[PDB]
């Protein structure tokens, strides 16, 4: 659940605005998790296309088949805008609920591996 997808279809195409990127992905020219570049900064289609206000929403989307736990995406968690998978958010919440402390749990885990 904590491993993230690395996809070869987009493979570092250059884009001006995220709308163009979303369009390219829409046509099927760029994979969701492919490492592209928009506005000179390296990102992915998934991070732009799906932006979740909170974990509950992201996991709700995973439940509806919108995205997969391994898809890299944008989730807003603890006042921070995070680029990560819903699965890593899930792990974070597992540790968090298990120890009944959100802050300490957030400190203990390594989210990015």
Q: Which residues bind other proteins (CB under 8 A)?
A: 5, 17-19, 48-54, 56-57, 59-61, 63-66, 76, 81
Taking the complex as a whole, the smallest distance from the CB of residue 107 to other proteins amounts, in Å, to 24
Backbone angles phi, psi at 88, to 5 degrees: -70, -35
Residue number, 75 or 88, with CB nearest to other proteins: 75
Which residue spans within the chain are E strands per DSSP? 14-15, 35-38, 41-44, 51-52, 73-77, 80-84
Strands in 51-52's sheet, in edge-to-edge order, are 51-52, 73-77, 80-84
Residue number, 98 or 110, with CB nearest to other proteins: 98
Taking the complex as a whole, the smallest distance from the CB of residue 40 to other proteins amounts, in Å, to 14
Taking the complex as a whole, the smallest distance from the CB of residue 60 to other proteins amounts, in Å, to 5
């Amino acid at each position: 659940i904590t491993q993230v997808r690395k996809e070869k279809k987009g493979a570092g195409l250059e884009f001006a605005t995220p709308e163009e990127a979303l369009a390219a992905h829409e046509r099927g020219e760029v994979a969701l998790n492919a490492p592209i570049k928009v506005a000179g900064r390296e990102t992915s289609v998934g991070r732009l296309k799906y932006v979740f206000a909170n974990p509950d929403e992201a996991l709700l989307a995973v439940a509806h088949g919108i995205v997969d736990l391994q898809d890299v995406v944008t989730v807003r968690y603890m006042g921070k805008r995070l680029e990560t998978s819903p699965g890593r958010i899930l792990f974070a919440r597992i540790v968090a609920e298990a120890v009944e402390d959100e802050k300490v749990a957030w400190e203990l885990i390594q989210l990015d591996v």
